[PDB]
Structures are given as C-alpha cells and as structure tokens.
Amino acid sequence: SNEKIRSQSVLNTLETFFIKENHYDMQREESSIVNACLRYLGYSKSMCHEKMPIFMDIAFIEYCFNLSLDPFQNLPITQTQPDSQQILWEYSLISNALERLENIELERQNCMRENKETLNNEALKLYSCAKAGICRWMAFHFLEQEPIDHINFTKFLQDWGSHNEKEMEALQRLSKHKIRKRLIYVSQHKKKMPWSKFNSVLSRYIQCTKLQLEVFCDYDFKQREIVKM
C-alpha cells in the first residue's frame, strides 16, 4: 500500500544513520529516531518477508559487539577501549548475531563471485577467526553461570560449534566441573586469547567486507577515501 512507500523511506533514513566509514555506534541523540524506525519496520506487514539489506546486519554486528576501529594507519575519531562487558552475552541474542554475521559472509561471497583475491582471502580467514571468537566467548559465558544451563549450552554447541569431539567432549567435561574450577579455566583461556584480539579481527573483517562490497559491487559504505589510499 502506502505502507510500502513508507517502509522504503524509513529504510532509506536508517541507511543514512547506519552506514558509517568507521563502525556504527548509537549516540543518545539518534536513539529515539533509530528506535522509531526499527519499530516501524518491525511492525510493517509489507516488510514481513522482505530481505534484510546487508547494511543493517553490518550495523547490528557493529552495535552488538561494540566494535571499535583497529588501524591503514589513518585518521582517528575519539573512541574508547575494548570491553566484553558492553557486550550482552546471551544465548538467543548471540545466536541471532551469528546468523547475521553469516548473512554478511554470504553476501560477501555472492559479490566476489561476480588485488581482489587477497581481499577475498583475508576476509575468509578473518571471518573464520571472528565466528570462532564469538562462539568461544559465548561458551565462556555459559561456563560462568551457576548453575549451568545445560540445554541451551548444548543446543548452542550444536548449532555453531565447529567443535568436533576433541572439543565439546572436553567442553562437556569442563562444564560439569564445580563452579570455582570452571571460573579458573575460563579465566585462563580468557587471558590466553583476550577479547581485544577478537574485537580487532571482527572490526577488520567488517571493514574489509565493506571495502570489498563498495569496490566490486554498487554498495556504498563510505570507504572511498580508503580505496587507493
């Protein structure tokens, strides 16, 4: 109806708020307008089966993981230190976040499927390392609960665990240890591969993806002053 024209306009405005040369973060001043837009789109029957434009999956991932730039030795905005406690480690949310990260890698690959190839392969490796990082820290969050929610822990390990048995048998064993011991283990693996490195990997994956798509398709992610530079 007029609903389609409205929804497409609202989506265009969101594009204006969401696509960022760096990473999207939501300032207090835009929070009401971004919220009204998401809600409108979220209750429009027109949009119930429309495909999520990838810029929204990218903004959602930037938001959800509080992504901060980590640099082509460029200019710097005034940003903050990385912290996994701005991140909401919750099974449903993080599961969906992995679906959307998968959407993004999917469209990246559809793009690269019609130099370029070092971008493509950088992206592939970044992606695997990021996906893994997210699963690892979701695991850590499950292991620090008392009592452990075993159902969701296992459903999660099934869906997103690349873990063959050398890991999730070890993970299950670790799971039914007493809480203080699980906390010791988690704290050791956290110190052995800290969130900051996965913030870097995910940041770089997203920027690398942005660049790829602006360059080899008709996406614009404000990467232009990055292109030959």
Binding site: M26, S31, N35, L38, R39, L41, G42, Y43, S44, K45, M47, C48, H49, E50, K51, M52, M56, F60, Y63, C64, Q86, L88, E90, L93, N96, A97
Partner: peptide, 29 residues
C-alpha cells in the same frame, strides 16, 4: 502466511527490533 494475515509481527525486521532493544536496555542498565 499463517502469521502475516493473522496480523502478527514476525520476520527479519521484527527480530532485529527485539534484539536491538535487548542490547540497548543492557547498555543502559
């Protein structure tokens, strides 16, 4: 669709909204 013309919210945008609210409430709380 068994929910579309039941008039019930669903699909990618609705899920986006719910998830975004979760993150925002967290960052405020």
């Amino acid at each position: 669709c068994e929910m579309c013309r039941l008039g019930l919210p669903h699909g990618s945008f609705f899920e986006l909204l719910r998830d975004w609210k979760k993150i925002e409430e967290f960052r405020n709380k």
